[PDB]
Amino acid sequence: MPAALVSISVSPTNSTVAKGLQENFKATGIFTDNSNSDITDQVTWDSSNTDILSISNASDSHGLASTLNQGNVKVTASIGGIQGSTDFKVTQ
């Protein structure tokens, strides 16, 4: 019988990065109610409020985070059940 168990496992990297750059990650979200990649559920992403940070998760799985601030920013995103977050520190 059918069942819903959308399990998403993201392995973000918590570290510091140079101003203006893009980081690639990996996110696999599949549900027994519909064997698909993380994209349909529309994983909600959030970025700190320092200068400017925008992270978008590809339709395949890997997510691309673009940062361009000067200081410290905390990026987090949750989809369905399991969720994860990454650390982005921009220093001169």
**Domain residues for 61?**
1-92
Dist CA 89 CA 7 (whole Å): 28
Beta bridge partners of 86: 75
Dist CA 15 CA 83 (whole Å): 18
Q: Decide: 75 and 53 in contact? Cβ < 8 Å.
A: yes
Q: Which of 33, 71, 35, 34 is nearest to 52 (CA)?
A: 71
What domain count does the chain have?
1
What is the dihedral angle through the alpha carbons of 60, 4, 8, 81, rounded to the nearest 10 degrees?
A: 130
What CATH number corresponds to the domain at position 15? Answer: 2.60.40.1080
**Strand bridging mode 15-16 / 53-57:** unpaired
User: What DSSP character marks residue 81?
Assistant: S
Burial 55-82 (b: 16+ CB within 10 A, else e): bebeeebebebebebeeebbbbbebbee
